[PDB]
Design a protein around this ligand. Structure first.
Ligand code: ZN
Length: 187
């Protein structure tokens, strides 16, 4: 094992990598932002934050989602405590990652997960849709990042230097196109 989570991201990187505008081209990296929240009946700690990143193809299946899964198991896990994991990924989980998550979930009954995504990854091919569809069936929330989501990420995973979040042109219209697409696919 090697991977430990980064604490945050640079404003240059975040604005580049989380662009939901139809630049399906050059973005050849996957970026995962998470929050992990422990609850011992009275909603105590833990609270954890971080950033995982990943090359889309080389390497593969030490994917940003697995990196998180692997790290989360050893370094964070506590018996008999309700967890609330939240992901904000730049690309949609591949079916493999999606399948590996479902397996991780059945093993850890005391953990819940929601995923927010900026773009939908390789979504014309059935395998990738099935993966998310499977997560929908396994009980996982899969959502498209709206305004308040990109802002939340700025307020949590970026070295923002006290600057406020500032949306890109057509962020809102992208969001809806991606919402309908995801809606139709998870019906
Ligand atoms: Zn994957």
């Amino acid at each position: 094992q090697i991977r430990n989570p980064m604490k945050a991201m640079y404003p240059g990187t975040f604005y580049f990598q989380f662009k939901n505008l139809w630049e399906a081209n050059d973005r050849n990296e996957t970026w995962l932002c998470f929050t992990v929240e422990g609850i011992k009946r009275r909603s105590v700690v833990s609270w954890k934050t971080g950033v995982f990143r990943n090359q889309v193809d080389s390497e593969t299946h030490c994917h940003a989602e697995r990196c998180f899964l692997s790290w989360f198991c050893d370094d964070i896990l506590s018996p008999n405590t309700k967890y609330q994991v939240t992901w904000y990924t730049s690309w949609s989980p591949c079916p493999d990652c999606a399948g590996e998550v479902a397996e991780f979930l059945a093993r850890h009954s005391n953990v819940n997960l929601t995923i927010f995504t900026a773009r939908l990854y390789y979504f014309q091919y059935p395998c990738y849709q099935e993966g998310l569809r499977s997560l929908s069936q396994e009980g996982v929330a899969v959502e498209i990042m709206d305004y308040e989501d990109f802002k939340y990420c700025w307020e949590n995973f970026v070295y923002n230097d006290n600057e406020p979040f500032k949306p890109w042109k057509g962020l809102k219209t992208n969001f809806r196109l991606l919402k309908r697409r995801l809606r139709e696919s998870l019906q």
